[PDB]
Amino acid sequence: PRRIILSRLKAGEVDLLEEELGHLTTLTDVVKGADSLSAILPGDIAEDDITAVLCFVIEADQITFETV
Amino acid sequence: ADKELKFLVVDDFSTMRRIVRNLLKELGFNNVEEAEDGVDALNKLQAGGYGFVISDWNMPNMDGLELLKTIRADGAMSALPVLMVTAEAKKENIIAAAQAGASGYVVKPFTAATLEEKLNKIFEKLGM
Ligand SMILES: [Mn+2]
Incomplete structure (x- = not known):
């Protein structure tokens, strides 16, 4: 069980990034802050792939993965 | 971005090419050419002068992924922006x-507003 945290998100990016992640996997325990998004990842996609796809929109330093 | 930026719209379906050309016109970009597949x-x-590529995924002879990889592996045009168009968010x-x-992807059919958001993010990332 792994957790993803996205920080310093701009207006409209919390929802957008939630949607982007949803095309890649199935998120649980989703927390949508005013400028952040965290969720639990089932572990069915490599984290390097999530990173590459999310970087179409944000920068890699805005993404952190950790063991819950 | 420079409104004279030269775009190449790649898709094997004529209607879809014309739709993309017309949405780009709506956004103020009129310097656009079309291609029917990767070849x-x-x-x-090679004719040169292109500054942006919007390419469909599924095409005969050479598909979009193959074209992207070929662009990226070339010397001269290796950094050309490339927006992939797909039929589904697979x-x-x-x-x-x-x-x-x-440089990014967009799901068809898409609107002028969606196209604009996708193009701006890319312009932002490449400093255009
Ligand atoms: Mn096609």
């Missing part, structure tokens, strides 16, 4: 586009 697109890209294609170096 035709590469031939045109995870393996989105991942494949990203890992192959696409």
Whole structure:
């Protein structure tokens, strides 16, 4: 069980990034802050792939993965 | 971005090419050319002067991923922006586009507003 945290998100990016992640996997325990998004990842996609796809929109330093 | 930026719209369906050309016109970009597949697109890209590629995923002879990878592996045009157009938000294609170096992707059919958001993010990332 792994957790993803996205920080310093701009207006409209919390929802957008939630949607982007949803095309890649199935998120649980989703927390949508005013400028952040965290969720639990089932572990069915490599984290390097999530990173590459999310970087179409944000920068890699805005993404952190950790063991819950 | 420079309104004279030269775009190449690649798609094997004429209607879809014309739709993309017209949406770009709506956004103020009128310097646009079209190609019918990866082979035709590469031939045109050699002519030089292109500053942005919007390419469909599924095409005969040479598909979009193959064209993207060929662009990226070339010397002269290796950093050309490339926006992949796909029919569905399929995870393996989105991942494949990203890992192959696409500047972004967009799902068709798309509107002028969606196109604009996608183009701006790319302009932002490449400093255009
Ligand atoms: Mn096609």
